[model samples]
Target: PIEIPAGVTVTVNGNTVTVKGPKGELTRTFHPDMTITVEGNVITVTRPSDEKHHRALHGTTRSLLANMVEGVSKGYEKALELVGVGYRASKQGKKLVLSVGYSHPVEIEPEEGLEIEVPSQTKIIVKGADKQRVGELAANIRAVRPPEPYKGKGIRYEGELVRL
Candidate 1:
């Protein structure tokens, strides 16, 4: 029920796509590529020609366009949990501070188009329009002090396993 066509308007200008939805607007440019057709609530993508590049980009372009549309409509998020006693995270202004068994606090600043949330000392929520960016930021945060099997003092993505 939460798939696509969620009031997101997709437009094509030459090889560029502009998506507008409830949350906001997102724009992307393809490789001058499409059987790419958008009519009513359906969007179909096709190759621009018979070259290897065209075939490779057909579905790739479609997927990225869908991502932009969905991002403008739904956004994306990732979360992590601190697994050690007194291990915690906090947001100071535009930076994120972590206390994961370190003698000194570790700090992180989001690049661009990202929001970090500290619901509690042990929880972090990263939100953004780009799924890759959100996931990458979460990974960087976890890498600061990756989880351990012993005493388990570190950061962990939800459901990720720590080697013992």
Candidate 2:
């Protein structure tokens, strides 16, 4: 059973649901036909029927709500590694500075409600209450210097494997 802690408010407004918790608040719109029941902090999402589309929507809706609950309760995080010679990352104020052997260092500014940190030159930590926001920031940072097969030089998620 997915337990929703007290003080967390889940609002079901038509197809859009908003969850407000200690960490933060997030909102999302779901399928119109799906049924979402929130009672005593527990949320239940049901399918409209046994149709194929309904089956897909059922799991999707449930998971989405589940993520919302988790997000507000504990938040989310993603880590990245900088590989290759002279490849590293650092934070200058609110912007991320990357020196991936390029002529000029690439700079990135994170989205609101997101936090970016560099514990070391080669490691980056992205944190946020919303799972999607954390992941989007990580992806955007990695795109600056995606790992290459030749020498595997670039930014990658922590523990991500690369072959050279």
Candidate 3:
């Protein structure tokens, strides 16, 4: 069983949940087709009497809520490094510009819920409250110019070791 930290309380009303953490409070409304409730400190997610899809949503919702609580309290960040000759990145306004071996620099627009920062000319830092979005943005950026399998050189997370 997952352990709920002290000073945190979870309450469920119908399909909605209110998670009260030391950092602050967060509330989320799940799809009505999913059944969820708070049992003691553990939030149990379930499905309606006879719905196959609802069964999948149950575990998904529970995990999402748990991540939400943890994120609001601790936050999340993903760092990526540009690794190629003359390949680098920079931030202009809220957009990220990259020179990843392309003839011309590629400009990427930042999404609404994500914050992208170029600490240096070659490093990109993405921060956000949503893990999924943050990860997706990182993936999309990497996809723009993925590392070559032969040299293992391209955009990758900091300290991410690659074996050629």
Candidate 4:
């Protein structure tokens, strides 16, 4: 179960929660052993009175719900940069083409739940509902040509402070 903070609506149906916020709506269902309740503006998730597993589920559910609420209301975005001689990125239809000092340019197909944009040749912005997935995808892009520790040259996240 997850606690619903103030400024967020928490509606319960069995183990599921329907959270409504200023930006949009999000729903999540918990395991059968869990019980969720809403008090005032705070939503709480608990387990059967004597269930030992409740401790583990508590934090996990809380964090998941928090992400859902924030994702629907504020969303999440990750920015990346391609750094190298002649390195760049371009959007073709729903695919992203990356040329990062590789023998050949690489083309990445955008997943259904992700939004990828290339505002400048060397800059990429990825947006999505799942923060984990967004970060993973960004890492994969950077791995294609990670920044060199020496020159700090390669694909890297914007605002990522790298020690040179």
Candidate 5:
């Protein structure tokens, strides 16, 4: 069961569920056999039977629905760190510019529903309502300069450790 916070609203029809909150709105579709019901301010997802496939879909549907709820309510964020001499990050308008050893800086634009932030030269933050988008964008950014084996000189998640 999922509880709807004070500022959030959830609606379900057919196989689709829509969640709206102060942060944003998200919609997702679940398996047709999975049952979604709302009572009071709570939402529940039920499986038709205990079969293996039904059990898998039951959990998957609930997980996706919870993610949608949390996404629209509080949102998600991923932080990255740039490590190396002169390696840094900045924002030019809505584009993210990275200077990670290439002769010329590399630029990236945010996808829809995502925001890029550079709090410091070596720090980058990706924020969005969707957890998957936030994580994917951060991974793409890190791929621009993956960490090296020796000095770990590259972009990486804030707390990730490079095995030397």
Candidate 6:
């Protein structure tokens, strides 16, 4: 069961669920056989039967619902660090420009539902309401300049280790 927080509203229509909170709004559709119910400020997920497919969807549906509730309320973020001295990130207008040892600066446009924050020249923060989306976007940025095993001079998750 997921407890709906104050200032958050959740609605269910068939297998589709929508959540709205202070952070933002999120909507998702679960497996049709997964039964979801909202009573008062609590939400619960149930499976139609104990069969293999039903059992699998039962947990997945609940997990996704919990993610939606938290995402709509607190949001999600991923932090990345540039290890090399010349490797840095900056924001220009709505785009993120990176200088990560490339001959030409790599410019990336932010997704419509996400925001990129460059607090320090070597630090990058990706923020969004969807956890999966936030992580995927962060991975894409890291892919641009993956850490090398030798010098470890590249883009990586904060505190991530690359074995030499």
Candidate lDDT (C-alpha), each: 0.79, 0.85, 0.77, 0.78, 0.90, 0.89
The runs of at least 3 residues in candidate 5 whose Cα sits more than 4 Å from the true structure, single-residue gaps closed, are 49-56
- Sort the predicted structures by lDDT, highest score first: 5, 6, 2, 1, 4, 3
Candidate 2 TM-score to native: 0.79
Error of 4 at 91 (Å): 1.4
RMSD, candidate 2, Å: 2.8
Candidate 3 lDDT over residue span 80-151, tens digit each = 998877888888889999988867989999776678999898899887767777889988888888778798
Q: How much lDDT does candidate 3 score? A: 0.77
Give residue 114's lDDT in candidate 5 (0 to 100): 86
For 1-164, candidate 2 gives per-residue lDDT tens digits of 24678778888777888888877888889888987767665887877789998998888888888888888888789999998888888899999999998899999888777889999999999987798789989999998879999988888889888888
**Per-residue lDDT of 1-164 in model 6, one digit per residue for the tens?**
89999999999998899999876788889888888899877998989899998888888888888889888789999999999878889999888899999899999887777889999999999988898889999999999989998889999998797876
Residues 1-164 of candidate 1: C-alpha lDDT, one tens digit per residue: 12357677878677777777765567777776565567666766767578987878876787787788777778899989998778878889999998877699999999767889998888999987788888899999999988777766788887877666
Q: Which prediction has the highest TM-score against the true structure?
A: 5
Off by over 4 Å in 3: 1-28, 31-62
The weakest ten consecutive residues by lDDT in model 1 span 1-10
- Stretches of candidate 1 off by over 4 Å are 1-11, 20-25, 35-56
Displacement of the residue 14 alpha carbon in candidate 3, Å: 5.4
Clashing pairs in 5: none
Estimate the Cα RMSD of every predicted model relative to the unseen true structure: 3.5, 2.8, 4.9, 3.9, 2.1, 2.2
- Candidate 5 structure, TM-score to reference: 0.86
The best candidate by lDDT is: 5
Give the Cα error of residue 123 in candidate 6, in Å: 0.3
Clash count per candidate? 0, 0, 0, 3, 0, 0
